[PDB]
Amino acid sequence: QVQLVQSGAEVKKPGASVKVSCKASGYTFDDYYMHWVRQAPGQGLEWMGWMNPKTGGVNYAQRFQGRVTMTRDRSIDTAYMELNSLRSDDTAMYYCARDYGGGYPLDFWGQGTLVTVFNQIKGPSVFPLAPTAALGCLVKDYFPEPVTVSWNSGALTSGVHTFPAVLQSSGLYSLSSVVTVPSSSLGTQTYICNVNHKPSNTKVDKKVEP
Amino acid sequence: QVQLVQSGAEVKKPGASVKVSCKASGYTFDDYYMHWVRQAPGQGLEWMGWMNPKTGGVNYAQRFQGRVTMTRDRSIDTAYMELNSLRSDDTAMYYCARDYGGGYPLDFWGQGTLVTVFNQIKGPSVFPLAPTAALGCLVKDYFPEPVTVSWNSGALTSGVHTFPAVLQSSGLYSLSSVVTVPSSSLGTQTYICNVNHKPSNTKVDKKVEP
Amino acid sequence: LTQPASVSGSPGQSITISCIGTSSDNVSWYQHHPGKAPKLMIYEVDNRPSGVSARFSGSKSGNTASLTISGLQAEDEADYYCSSYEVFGTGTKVTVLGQPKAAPSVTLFPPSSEELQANKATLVCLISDFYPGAVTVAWKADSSPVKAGVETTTPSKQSNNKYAASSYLSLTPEQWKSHRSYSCQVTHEGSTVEKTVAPT
Amino acid sequence: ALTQPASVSGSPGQSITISCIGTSSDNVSWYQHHPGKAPKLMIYEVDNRPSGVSARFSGSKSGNTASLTISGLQAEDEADYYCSSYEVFGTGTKVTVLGQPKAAPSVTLFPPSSEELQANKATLVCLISDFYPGAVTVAWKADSSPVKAGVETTTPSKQSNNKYAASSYLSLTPEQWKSHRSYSCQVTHEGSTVEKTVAPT
Numbered sequence: 001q002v003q004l005v006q007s008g009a010e011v012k013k014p015g016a017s018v019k020v021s022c023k024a025s026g027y028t029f030d031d032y033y034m035h036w037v038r039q040a041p042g043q044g045l046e047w048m049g050w051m052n053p054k055t056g057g058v059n060y061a062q063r064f065q066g067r068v069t070m071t072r073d074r075s076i077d078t079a080y081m082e083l084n085s086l087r088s089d090d091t092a093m094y095y096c097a098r099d100y101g102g103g104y105p106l107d108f109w110g111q112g113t114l115v116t117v118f119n120q121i122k123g124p125s126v127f128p129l130a131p132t133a134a135l136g137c138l139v140k141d142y143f144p145e146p147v148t149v150s151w152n153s154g155a156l157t158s159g160v161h162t163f164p165a166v167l168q169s170s171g172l173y174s175l176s177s178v179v180t181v182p183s184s185s186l187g188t189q190t191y192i193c194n195v196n197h198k199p200s201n202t203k204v205d206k207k208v209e210p
Numbered sequence: 211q212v213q214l215v216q217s218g219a220e221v222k223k224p225g226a227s228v229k230v231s232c233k234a235s236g237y238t239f240d241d242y243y244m245h246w247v248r249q250a251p252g253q254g255l256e257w258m259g260w261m262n263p264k265t266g267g268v269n270y271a272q273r274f275q276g277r278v279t280m281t282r283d284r285s286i287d288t289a290y291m292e293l294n295s296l297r298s299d300d301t302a303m304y305y306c307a308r309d310y311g312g313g314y315p316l317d318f319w320g321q322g323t324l325v326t327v328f329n330q331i332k333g334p335s336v337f338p339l340a341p342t343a344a345l346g347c348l349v350k351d352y353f354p355e356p357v358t359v360s361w362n363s364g365a366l367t368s369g370v371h372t373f374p375a376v377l378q379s380s381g382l383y384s385l386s387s388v389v390t391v392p393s394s395s396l397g398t399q400t401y402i403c404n405v406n407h408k409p410s411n412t413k414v415d416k417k418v419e420p
Numbered sequence: 421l422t423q424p425a426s427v428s429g430s431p432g433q434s435i436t437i438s439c440i441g442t443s444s445d446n447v448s449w450y451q452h453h454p455g456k457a458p459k460l461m462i463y464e465v466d467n468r469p470s471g472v473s474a475r476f477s478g479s480k481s482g483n484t485a486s487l488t489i490s491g492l493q494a495e496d497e498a499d500y501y502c503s504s505y506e507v508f509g510t511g512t513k514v515t516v517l518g519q520p521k522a523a524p525s526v527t528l529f530p531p532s533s534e535e536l537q538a539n540k541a542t543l544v545c546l547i548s549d550f551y552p553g554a555v556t557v558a559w560k561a562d563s564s565p566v567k568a569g570v571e572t573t574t575p576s577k578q579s580n581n582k583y584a585a586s587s588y589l590s591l592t593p594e595q596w597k598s599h600r601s602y603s604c605q606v607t608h609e610g611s612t613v614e615k616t617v618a619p620t
Numbered sequence: 621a622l623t624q625p626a627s628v629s630g631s632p633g634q635s636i637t638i639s640c641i642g643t644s645s646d647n648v649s650w651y652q653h654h655p656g657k658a659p660k661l662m663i664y665e666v667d668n669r670p671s672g673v674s675a676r677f678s679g680s681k682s683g684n685t686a687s688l689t690i691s692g693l694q695a696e697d698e699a700d701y702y703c704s705s706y707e708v709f710g711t712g713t714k715v716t717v718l719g720q721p722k723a724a725p726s727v728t729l730f731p732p733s734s735e736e737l738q739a740n741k742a743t744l745v746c747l748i749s750d751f752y753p754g755a756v757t758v759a760w761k762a763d764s765s766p767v768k769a770g771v772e773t774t775t776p777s778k779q780s781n782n783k784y785a786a787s788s789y790l791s792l793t794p795e796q797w798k799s800h801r802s803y804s805c806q807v808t809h810e811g812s813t814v815e816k817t818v819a820p821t
Binding site: 043044063125127129130134138140161163164166167168169174176206 | 529532544567
């Protein structure tokens with residue numbers, strides 16, 4: 001029988017590092033590649049990479065290069081996967097899976113681990129939304145609610161609609177606020193969005209221009 | 211025309227104080243009482259109290275006594291409602307409405323003010339749940355997720371069910387974990403529940419007894 | 421006070437709102453449209469304020485007061501609270517069912533130049549002014565449906581009794597410039613509306 | 621981008637098929653994933669079966685679209701099913717099996733603890749579990765008169781035994797806990813109601 005046992009579930013702060021172990025039994029650990037796959041919160045399976053145990057060569061996905069390092073210890077037939085600078089998105093289920101030969105037929109998945117990355121106080125990232133025309137400001141990746149957006153320091157109140165926030169899979173909030181202005185004043189009057197996030201003590205002014 | 215203009219929307223930290231203005235125009239400010247009514251975050255209206263502007267006497271609801279200070283400035287015909295040490299439950303819409311006599315025809319309700327009290331990183335208040343029987347622990351008022359619960363330093367793992375947390379009106383989380391043990395061992399072996407809330411760095415142990 | 425959690429009907433159904441546990445005399449009703457302060461509908465039992473419609477009428481049956489609306493107009497949907505002395509009711513979610521359907525309005529924004537200067541690329545697809553509140557959002561990259569990194573909020577009430585929702589697509593800057601256009605498709609009551617943006 | 625249906629429903633013997641749109645020729649793999657345990661491979665390449673897997677699972681390819689046919693939906697074969705062509709998997713399909721044995725709920729109610737009462741707080745915890753399906757109504761009564769304020773109920777969720785559990789919390793001041801005679805938690809499930817009553821002893 002072939003068994004793969006993974007480390008215990010861990011909860012980590014953002015910016016910390018988590019190393020998940022994966023001990024192999026019932027087969028020669030060197031003769032098969034070891035892939036690592038996520039599950040994401042409510043999303044689908046995601047391929048992280050693979051590591052040749054016999055030589056140590058590692059291949060990583062283009063979205064994880066520079067953040068993930070896969071090592072192994074042949075003395076105890078175990079593999080490792082480490083994530084550095086954990087983000088709010090990184091909370092997921094991490095599985096180690098054995099590759100039968102080349103290509104990509106998968107054989108076993110072990111048990112999986114839960115690496116929960118809790119949310120911290122974060123300031124929003126405010127970006128413009130270039131353009132009767134509509135222009136606005138994007139308020140992305142802030143925690144927790146609420147945020148306050150005022151245009152031209154409260155002077156512009158007509159045609160302003162600030163849509164309710166969305167709870168992303170990471171757990172952070174994102175919000176948008178757009179205003180409706182005549183098309184003849186685009187290159188004429190500046191439109192500034194004043195965003196306030198008191199929980200993070202963040203006051204930001206951004207200029208919306210075409 | 212009779213109008214009641216209220217102050218702007220305010221966001222406050224827990225423990226802070228908020229004062230809401232209500233300036234009356236178009237009628238004699240002295241001849242009519244001024245009530246203050248909440249809306250709650252998605253719940254129904256909730257009466258706080260009423261104030262006599264002619265005499266200065268006030269009457270508060272039993273659940274707000276010692277917390278709300280209603281005062282008026284008859285010079286400019288304005289009424290004020292002050293909430294001291296805002297809790298996470300205090301995020302709601304606040305309205306001022308005028309009335310008279312024992313009857314309650316609250317004719318004008320002003321405009322309203324949105325007071326938002328953001329959730330803070332708080333550790334859980336662990337309480338015991340005294341009792342084939344079942345005993346457990348209450349994990350109340352923690353934010354944000356997650357919390358880890360173990361019994362007897364992980365020695366007890368049979369018949370343990372840690373229910374998913376509930377998102378209350380305040381925005382905090384409450385969770386419960388229980389263990390099922392034979393009824394003959396209540397007076398023989400103790401029971402300790404260990405609750406971990408890493409975001410607030412809280413580790414608490416409690417003993418559950420009948 | 422005890423009130424129904426929600427009542428349902430249609431234009432002309434004329435649903436009556438119950439108010440259990442009230443004492444004799446001095447019963448008032450309030451209509452609260454979200455986003456605005458509530459207004460008085462019934463003075464005491466059956467009286468009406470000047471300027472309010474006669475379509476709203478109140479009555480009392482000794483121990484329980486009630487409010488009758490002769491015709492459920494498309495304008496008259498709100499939370500209703502009956503108050504005896506200084507305590508209101510539970511709140512009735514008075515919803516309609518025969519209302520005309522309103523097609524959604526979709527606005528799509530490509531990732532900003534500033535955001536692209538931080539290795540981030542997000543597409544904002546804002547939906548507004550649609551009834552009822554049920555829209556399906558699908559993203560397509562040059563016709564290929566894409567689901568990874570899509571966050572769509574649940575629809576919410578506006579100040580004009582219509583619904584609004586927002587859909588976001590998180591992308592890396594490399595995959596934003598590789599495709600020729602990204603499309604936000606929103607389907608509402610069978611009729612779909614589509615907006616496309618390009619790296620320009 | 622391999623596209624799978626969001627969810628599929630059936631019953632014993634329904635014999636539903638899961639579609640895997642957008643797959644290339646050859647090298648199509650299917651994985652069955654019961655949450656809380658590692659996913660297990662079911663189909664190697666289009667139609668091959670690992671030793672020890674059930675013949676109930678068979679795969680096929682209709683030119684460009686892969687598919688996973690199950691001969692008869694057993695009440696156990698409920699899970700998320702993913703199709704992978706090389707390293708990228710599908711959206712995932714929520715397989716739900718119907719006609720499953722309905723289970724009566726089990727309810728435990730705890731009065732406010734002594735420590736919590738010494739904090740001017742009072743919480744009643746009504747914990748429900750081991751009921752199928754996950755459709756229950758929780759009502760709080762105080763001396764026969766229902767109470768609605770200060771009630772927060774979580775949505776029922778899957779357990780480790782494929783049954784549903786939900787928890788309900790009633791928040792009160794200490795004065796109203798002692799003044800009343802008994803607070804009761806009533807949960808209705810498929811036409812039968814289960815009641816648990818506590819009091820200030």
